[model samples]
Target: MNIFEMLRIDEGLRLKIYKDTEGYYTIGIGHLLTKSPSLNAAKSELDKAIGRNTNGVITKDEAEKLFNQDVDAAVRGILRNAKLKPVYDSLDAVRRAALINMVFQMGETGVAGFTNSLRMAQQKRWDEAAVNLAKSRWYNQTPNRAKRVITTFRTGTWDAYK
Candidate 1:
């Protein structure tokens, strides 16, 4: 119909977290999260709020609310674990988003274990940063995801993994 309506339809399809790609226990758009508290709690309070059983689900409306909450707390998570903050805060917003998403995936401490990667990245040395990123077990385990972050960490924007 109208532009707003068209954008709404597109966003629905884009943001919908259907049951297919479900590892990382990633919820709310694409950011992974603290699965222990609720995302993995098949019997989670969110599920109960939706009045479903272990195999539970949420509506788009609910996902919107949940994601907002999740991302906020993840930001807080980064703040809580501040050893990473000096580097974390130095980046621009999107770069901050890139790094925080991993913090979501690995927790503040776990993600910072990529010491060299973070070190080279903060120096704005793209190639060395990506190399250090590749050397980690995280890269080995999630190469595609790793490349995206490494390159973004290397640069200012999101990059397609090469």
Candidate 2:
């Protein structure tokens, strides 16, 4: 169900490396690099994509295996943020997923900067946490998406998460 599943699931496809949610260099259906690539890593992918790293394209099948190989580990990587551990484990599953998604989109430091939001959530003040989340620049830029995340925060429900 790798490419088969991902072929239907992921929104679109890009063969070359692009900035992922937290600015990590990535390729082929969100296959994140541990960091910015060294020259060699750059060279090969670029050769395929041709220097610009955005030229030649991979097939939908390639993206499928690539995502299968890459996605689970990357999502789990968020747990390495020790500071986020307590709150992360403390929350209910849906809210926990929300925090992980936030960490993916913003990184630990970025999420932590939402101090009031973190505090509110820590206190189990779900509504206030949702409010604080709305005040972020991320919210400023993506209202509906921000609200969707906030909805998980506001009410620890996972009935219809997208």
Candidate 3:
């Protein structure tokens, strides 16, 4: 399932869904760990956030706004500070986007910590990359997140962000 679907977002309140599959309910424009709103409102807002407009697919800008507004800087910071800069910088377009998605879910440190995997990927060693990718702390951390990213990297047919 897609990210939004995995989060079970519906819409009323706005909140960030954590990588731990933890869903927080909020009612505001900014990110904070305040009291959650009514479940109905939260579901409503989440649904609206996840819903598609006339274009069908959610635009990247919209997705970013939704995620950024909902997820706190601490959450984003965790992803950023994980220090996968080398891995991110070295990958091709398709692998990069897949890595970004993985980082978004697993955090930067989680992805960066996969030293051997990153090395293999840097060397364009697809088999080793796949093997090491599956041996990450994040591989079994979340539900199918690492597997999907590895799949995208291995298949080499996924699209990248423009």
Candidate 4:
């Protein structure tokens, strides 16, 4: 039910470089390296994790490290969002975790597009919030995972984790 486990299931672990759905060069728990930051940092991290020069592969432990870092970034992004901060803070941990998961998947700007849903959520109109979220392209793109998150938002429970 924690963000780590939720995201682990959602993102899945990859030990080798592979193109994501959008063709981004990704590896090790959804870490994007395509046209990103010289690529050396992640490569070096993988190398350091395995204690040898990497041939584009990472270990479970190494992947977990990247996952944790991404999760932290998502959390920070949510907290730092000026408009979303108060709404995020007003919610219970379960609901808050749901927000974090959405932000984790979509990024703050992506989640910011959920203005109506977020407003409903802020007002504690759970079903309305869920309805708005369910109407999105994000939902269509990943219906299964989006359902879990939407249900979590609506019920304020860990039922989605079940």
Cα error, candidate 4, residue 73 (Å) = 1.0
Question: Residue 109 in model 4: shift from native, Å?
Answer: 0.7
lDDT of 4 by residue, 36-89 (tens): 444566566556655788778877887787788888888899889987898899
C-alpha lDDT values of all predictions? 0.58, 0.62, 0.52, 0.82
For each candidate, give its TM-score against the true structure. Answer: 0.67, 0.64, 0.52, 0.85
Q: Against the true structure, candidate 2 has what lDDT?
A: 0.62
Q: Which candidate leads in lDDT? A: 4
**Worst ten in a row by lDDT for model 1:** 2-11
Winner by lDDT between candidate 3 and candidate 2: 2
lDDT of 3 by residue, 94-154 (tens): 6665665655554566666777877788788988889877775567664365565677777
In candidate 2, which residue ranges exceed 4 Å CA deviation? Answer: 1-55, 65-75, 159-162
Q: Indicate which candidate wins on TM-score.
A: 4
By lDDT rank, best first, the candidates go 4, 2, 1, 3
List candidate 3 stretches off by more than 4 Å: 1-64, 68-83, 159-162
What is the alpha-carbon lDDT of model 4 when measured against the actual structure? 0.82
lDDT for model 3, on a 0 to 1 scale? Answer: 0.52
Among residues 3 or more apart in sequence or in different chains, the pairs in candidate 1 whose N, CA or C atoms overlap within 3 Å are none
lDDT of 2 by residue, 58-101 (tens): 56666666655444443566467666766777788777767755
